[PDB]
Amino acid sequence: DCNRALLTRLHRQTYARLYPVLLVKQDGSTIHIRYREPRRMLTMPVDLDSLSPEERRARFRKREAKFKE
Amino acid sequence: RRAAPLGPMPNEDIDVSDLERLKKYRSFD
Amino acid sequence: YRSKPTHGIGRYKHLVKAQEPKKKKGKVEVRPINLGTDYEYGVLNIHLIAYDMALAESYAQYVHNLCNHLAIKVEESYAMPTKTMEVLQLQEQGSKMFLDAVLTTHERVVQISGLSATFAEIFLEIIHSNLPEGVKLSVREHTEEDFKGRFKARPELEELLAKLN
Amino acid sequence: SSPWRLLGALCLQRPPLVTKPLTPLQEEMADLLQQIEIERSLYSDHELRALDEAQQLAKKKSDLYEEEDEQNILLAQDLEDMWEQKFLHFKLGARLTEADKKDDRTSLHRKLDRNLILLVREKLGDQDIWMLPQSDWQPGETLRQTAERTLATLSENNMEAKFLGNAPCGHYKFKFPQAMRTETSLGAKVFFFKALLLTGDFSQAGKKGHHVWVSKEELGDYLKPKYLAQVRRFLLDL
Amino acid sequence: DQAAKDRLKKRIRRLEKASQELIPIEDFITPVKFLNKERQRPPVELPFEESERRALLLKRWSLYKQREHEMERSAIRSLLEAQEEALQELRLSSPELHAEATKRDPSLFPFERQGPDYTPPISDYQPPEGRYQDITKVYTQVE
RNA sequence: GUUAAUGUAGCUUAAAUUAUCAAAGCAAGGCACUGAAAAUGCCUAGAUGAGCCUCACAGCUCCAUAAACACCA
RNA sequence: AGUAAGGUCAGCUAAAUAAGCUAUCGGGCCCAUACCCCGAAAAUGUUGGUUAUACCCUUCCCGUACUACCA
Ligand SMILES: *C(=O)[C@@H](N)Cc1ccccc1
Ligand SMILES: [Mg+2]
Incomplete structure (x- = not known):
């Protein structure tokens, strides 16, 4: 019974057009969402600030090594 | 000198207490 | 008339509630928060949060209508103010950012009254099972702090409050 | 005491991970609802740029008197192509995992759109009967805590599960066979408590011979008609 | 000095005597962006053949x-009956545990649960980085 | 198999070839309608448990619901 | 007792467009102080009602004022 409420409409009278956009979460999971732009898919970036200094240093070395060979 | 009614009163069946539990009319028709 | 047997046939004020009028000076949301009955939980807030306006409201209506069929008193069906976050993604081979997209959050709250302790398992079972897609159900207590988010901010007091401290 | 033996059973349930497929009727109406949205809506900013191309192209056809030839760089059609190429290149997971193909009724990655109820095999009287996890009630312990203790008694488990208050959700009374039936222990009373599995799973030591996860459709096969009836009462179909 | 404190106390009470304003919901208030911006669809044509199948x-x-x-009403009916019959049945056998099972036990709330996603989270996925700005147009008023 | 209660739609009316104009009323749903409910407009779905008896009163029985003696880990 | 009548920056006044002077705080001039020049801060006795407030009314409180006579 997970499809008993999703079938609906934007109940308004003066609304801009919306397009189906498959938004992927931080992990690989995705949820179907209506969005202003007709873009097909969008990804949620990682909040690097939340990481601790030892966690930040872990993420600092990954990208620098990845960009290098 | 109050007298006793000769029969059942019109609105005495419903319970005065717990008004919210009783469903209302919600309509004029 | 008093002595007639048909006295009080026109009594109606005991049928409807008193319905205290919202006085101009006495206008206040006086809510007697009930807490911890023998089998009746306190006032609860069903916070439904979703990214899509249409999907969030559609499930909000289902919760409100389900309560009426189940004889669950609904005090209010208000809506928490929306929050908009600017999604910025990082640019590859670089460090400077760029505006990726503008995603918003929509929250709908269906405040409910006390329910029997037995019905708590049954009622919540229907709710969480019917979460359509990505709707973040959150059944929390109705504390004043959870209700403070609906109001505005008052920097005029904060100017005084900071100096008071 | 009482002749009946008090037992606290745990009805551990896995919430579905993926949205269930739309029925054929719902597919037709979903198209209709989406179609009505476009008809009753206004022109979005992207749709405005669709006419913006028409505004410029019409000038490039007849009104070749434009003041500025710089204009923009990208096009509305081009922008959609930019996101389309990324989306087509990008790949997602599979709704039907390898567990469904292999019919591995132990892993939690099977039937992501369904509900799995934990079943374990217990040997009583030299007979193996699949049943819900359960434990015996003890003095100074509530019936709900008996089901709570049953989760901790599982073989090498790290699962965290939210329970549902303290009231029960079902009952099942059975009497021992007359061979071993006595006045001291006439039978036992099994009480079921529902819980939602948040996170965690069993280790790799024992999987096939310890526990299985099935839905209500195939729940009856592993059970027996007497025990089956009471389980299906409180199990909400989903 | 001491009189200045008196006014500060009085200024506190004066602001208290005012109403607690509520933030208007901008979702129900369409901005002027869509206020007759020539963004009107052409007169919609409805085929007769489409209308009959639609209705x-x-x-x-x-x-x-x-x-x-x-089915949903029957399902909750059975679930309510199943729980109600077991609760009353256990009460006769074990009255002490019945009181524990009926009293309000704060072991359920909060019950924060999320909904299922379209696709399961894939294994070993590394999303890119970035930052989340929150504009959230502020609404501060004074009296 | 056996022992004791009940079976017009969700409740309930008339009815139950007892006679009569007739299977009714309220609930329960979809859509539209400032945003929730509610009103309002448009609009969807329908049962006389089963047979026998009586044919000019209506009930017995059957079956089923459902409890019990009672198969059970 | 009754009646009359007033509260405004620390202080005193004028307006309700809350201003002016002084005091207070900071800086300059001088050997130092004061004068002087420059800059800043500061309030409507109290409660309630006055579309909403303020000058108004009301409540509370302080203090001011007149009269209390014929036998
Ligand atoms: C089940 O049929 C019985 N064998 C269960 C049992 C009862 C008592 C002692 C051991 C087993
Ligand atoms: Mg409505």
Whole structure:
């Protein structure tokens, strides 16, 4: 019974057009969402600030090594 | 000198207490 | 008339509630928060949060209508103010950012009254099972702090409050 | 005491991970609802740029008197192509995992759109009967805590599960066979408590011979008609 | 000095005597962006053949919706009966545990649960980085 | 198999070839209608448990619901 | 007792467009102080009602004022 409420409409009278956009979460999971732009898919970036200094240093070395060979 | 009614009163069946539990009319028709 | 047997046939004020009028000076949301009955939980807030306006409201209506069929008193069906976050993604081979997209959050709250302790398992079972897609159900207590988010901010007091401290 | 033996059973349930497929009727109406949205809506900013191309192209056809030839760089059609190429290149997971193909009724990655109820095999009287996890009630312990203790008694488990208050959700009374039936222990009373599995799973030591996860459709096969009836009462179909 | 404190105390009470304003919901208030910006669809043409199948389909949707309510209402009916019959049955055998099972036990709330996603989270996925700015147009007023 | 209660739609009316104009009323649903409910407009779905008896009163029985003696880990 | 009548920056006044002077705080001039020049801060006795407030009314409180006579 997970499809008993999703079938609906934007109940308004003066609304801009919306397009189906498959938004992927931080992990690989995705949820179907209506969005202003007709873009097909969008990804949620990682909040690097939340990481601790030892966690930040872990993420600092990954990208620098990845960009290098 | 109050007298006793000769029969059942019109609105005495419903319970005065717990008004919210009783469903209302919600309509004029 | 008093002595007639048909006295009080026109009594109606005991049928409807008193319905205290919202006085101009006495206008206040006086809510007697009930807490911890023998089998009746306190006032609860069903916070439904979703990214899509249409999907969030559609499930909000289902919760409100389900309560009426189940004889669950609904005090209010208000809506928490929306929050908009600017999604910025990082640019590859670089460090400077760029505006990726503008995603918003929509929250709908269906405040409910006390329910029997037995019905708590049954009622919540229907709710969480019917979460359509990505709707973040959150059944929390109705504390004043959870209700403070609906109001505005008052920097005029904060100017005084900071100096008071 | 009482002749009946008090037992606290745990009805551990896995919430579905993926949205269930739309029925054929719902597919037709979903198209209709989406179609009505476009008809009753206004022109979005992207749709405005669709006419913006028409505004410029019409000038490039007849009104070749434009003041500025710089204009923009990208096009509305081009922008959609930019996101389309990324989306087509990008790949997602599979709704039907390898567990469904292999019919591995132990892993939690099977039937992501369904509900799995934990079943374990217990040997009583030299007979193996699949049943819900359960434990015996003890003095100074509530019936709900008996089901709570049953989760901790599982073989090498790290699962965290939210329970549902303290009231029960079902009952099942059975009497021992007359061979071993006595006045001291006439039978036992099994009480079921529902819980939602948040996170965690069993280790790799024992999987096939310890526990299985099935839905209500195939729940009856592993059970027996007497025990089956009471389980299906409180199990909400989903 | 001491009089200045008196006014500060009085200024506190004066602001207290005012109403607690509520933030208007901008979702229900359409901005001036869509206020007659030439963004009107052309006069919609409805085929007669499309209309008859559209209306006829809605009749089945009404019937199908009633089917969902019937099973759901029957499902909650059985679930309520199953729990109610076990609670009363146990009360006779174990009155002490019945009181524990009926009293309000704060072991349920909060019950924060999320909904299922379209796809399961893939294994070993590394999303890119970035930052989340929150504009959230502020609304501060004074009296 | 056996022992004791009940079976017009969700409740309930008339009815139950007892006679009569007739299977009714309220609930329960979809859509539209400032945003929730509610009103309002348009609009969807329908049962006389089963047979026998009586044919000019209506009940017995059957079956089923459902409890019990009672198969059970 | 009754009646009359007033509260405004620390202080005193004028307006309700809350201003002016002084005091207070900071800086300059001088060997130092004061004068002087420059800059800043500061309030409507109290409660309630006055579309909403303020000058108004009301409540509370302080203090001011007149009269209390014929036998
Ligand atoms: C089940 O049929 C019995 N064998 C269960 C049992 C009862 C008592 C002692 C051991 C087993
Ligand atoms: Mg409505």
